[PDB]
RNA sequence: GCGGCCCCCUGGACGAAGACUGACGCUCAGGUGCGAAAGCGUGGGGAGCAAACAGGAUUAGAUACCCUGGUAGUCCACGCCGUAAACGAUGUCGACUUGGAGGUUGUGCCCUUGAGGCGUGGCUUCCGGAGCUAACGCGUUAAGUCGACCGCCUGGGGAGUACGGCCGCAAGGUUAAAACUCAAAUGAAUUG
């Protein structure tokens, strides 16, 4: 509906979460899931397969509009990353972008220390 | 050399990012790249060239 | 059963604030559920006909899960008791361990208890229920016996105490 | 760190930025902080693969 | 111990030729100052995470190894505290003694003619001669041969405590305690 070949792909794979998210400029919802929503609890939410078949499931709860391309906001070194962007570009539709946003604080917060393992 | 005003030329040492390129890549004397990494900052102050490529 | 997984001809909805909506398709509820722009979890599948709750998606998953997480820690808090007991006891390091088990018991844990006799008392087992006594006779009133020994296993002896409940 | 990637790639190609970004050494303050070790553990491959 | 960019004071360091003073030097008992971080006093802040502390899982467990919160605290203002594996585990100053491969800093000349040689200093690493060491090793910046002057050591544990004194209300810091016990604690190097 209403194609505009611009927007976004909010993408943030984390140790325990990998989520895909899609809005356009202004950011009125419009599709986003969660691996954790897909289930895999435990230590396998961010598991590439977990992974990727979130990406499938944001990417069917979101085809229903069909616009041509967006862009990809890349965040996270989390495992994963590439199953999701794999089943994500795999959907046939073109990308513009994949941009890791992920900030380069210099010097900005002492982080914490306890955990041994 | 000791001018600053080269900022084409200067942009051949910065990366695609503007990122401080070490003369292990350049082969540059310590001396030169000391000089132009104060050109670099300077100019970045200046927003010739940004902090990074992203703004 | 998620979006086309439902199976059955007719459900059971009822609106987020709890209004009766009686037997209605499930185009209608999907089609609220997509403008909701949230997921969609169905709770009871096996029930005829099936219960359905509406309430935005993780809002009511996580309140559910605080629910029960509470419930989860309303049990009592588990570290893990086990002090042997050997009947080579010496005078004080005796109410060092008697202070240790019931500075445990206290707290109000299960019972974890192993005690080893030392070397050739499968003979001379009286000393070992002697000894036992005067654990039950130093705990007439601080702890109570659930099950009397017969048996040695090996070395060791598998016995469970309980705790003392106010009743 | 933008850039305008297209469809045949699919992977990776952005070694140069990623490198760059280098995501490890804020993984790592993330969990403990130092602010001495690290000057004794290098200085070594230079002095070793030498011949 | 010191790292973004600006503006005021600046012990140093070496290269150049010249210049004039004419022994004016070294260690320096006590004495004097500086001095990692934590901490303690009065004024503002807590983005930061963490001392205690709060919730959980855990084996033979002992507040434990991981999770979520979390107070001091770290930052500027003044004072105190003066200790640390404050180690290159090498007190300071001067003189002599094989060779090589480095970087780093500078002037002189001749082809700067590119990215050569020359004499430069200070450090840097790898070496390794002789020599020195118990060995490990050290090895022109010697742990080599000498010179001059301070500090410090005399078996182990007892013990950097007993007391006194000194300094700091504060935490403590320097001077140093025997009776008793042991036949040993050691340091380097060969087979699992």
Redesign the interface.
């Given at each position: 509906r209403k194609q505009v070949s611009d927007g976004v792909a909010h993408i943030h794979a984390s140790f325990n979460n990998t989520i895909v998210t899609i809005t356009d400029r202004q950011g009125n919802?419009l599709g986003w899931?969660t691996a954790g929503?897909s289930g895999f609890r435990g230590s396998r939410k961010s598991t590439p397969f977990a992974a990727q078949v979130a990406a499938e499931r944001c990417a069917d709860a979101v085809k229903e509009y069909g616009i041509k391309n967006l862009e990809?906001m890349v965040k996270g070194?989390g495992p994963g990353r590439?199953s999701t962007?794999?089943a994500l570009?795999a959907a046939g539709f073109?990308?513009?972008?994949?941009?890791?946003?992920?900030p380069?604080?210099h010097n900005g917060c002492?982080?914490?220390?306890k955990?041994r393992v | 050399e000791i001018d600053y005003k080269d900022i084409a030329t200067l942009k051949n040492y910065i990366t695609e990012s503007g990122k401080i390129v070490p003369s292990r890549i350049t082969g540059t004397r310590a001396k030169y790249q000391r000089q132009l990494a104060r050109a670099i900052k300077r100019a970045r102050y200046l927003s010739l060239l940004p902090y990074?490529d992203?703004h | 059963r998620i979006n086309g997984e439902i199976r059955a001809q007719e459900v059971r909805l009822t609106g987020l604030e709890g209004e009766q909506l009686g037997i209605v398709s499930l185009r209608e509820a999907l089609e609220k559920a997509e403008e909701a722009?949230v997921?969609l979890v169905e709770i009871s599948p096996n029930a005829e006909p099936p219960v359905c709750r509406i309430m935005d998606?993780?809002k009511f998953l996580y309140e559910k899960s605080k629910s029960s997480k509470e419930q989860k820690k309303k049990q009592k808090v588990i570290q893990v008791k086990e002090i042997k007991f050997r009947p080579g006891t010496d005078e004080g390091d005796y109410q060092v361990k008697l202070r240790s088990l019931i500075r445990f018991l206290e707290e109000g844990d299960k019972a974890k208890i192993t005690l080893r006799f030392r070397g050739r008392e499968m003979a001379h087992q009286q000393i070992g229920m002697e000894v036992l006594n005067r654990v039950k006779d130093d705990l007439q009133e601080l702890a109570v016996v659930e099950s009397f020994p017969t048996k040695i296993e090996g070395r060791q002896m598998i016995m469970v105490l309980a705790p003392k409940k106010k009743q | 760190?933008?850039?305008?990637?297209?469809?045949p790639f699919?992977?990776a190609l952005?070694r140069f930025?990623?490198s760059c970004?280098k995501?490890?050494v804020?993984?790592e303050?993330?969990?403990?902080?130092f602010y001495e070790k690290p000057t004794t553990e290098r200085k070594r491959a230079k002095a070793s693969a030498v011949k």
């Open positions: 919802a899931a929503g990809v070194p590439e962007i794999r570009n073109r990308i513009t972008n994949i941009t890791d946003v992920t380069i604080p002492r982080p914490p220390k955990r | 990074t992203r | 722009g997921d998606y993780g | 760190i933008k850039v305008r990637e297209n469809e699919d992977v952005r930025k990623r970004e995501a490890g804020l993984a303050v993330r969990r403990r902080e």
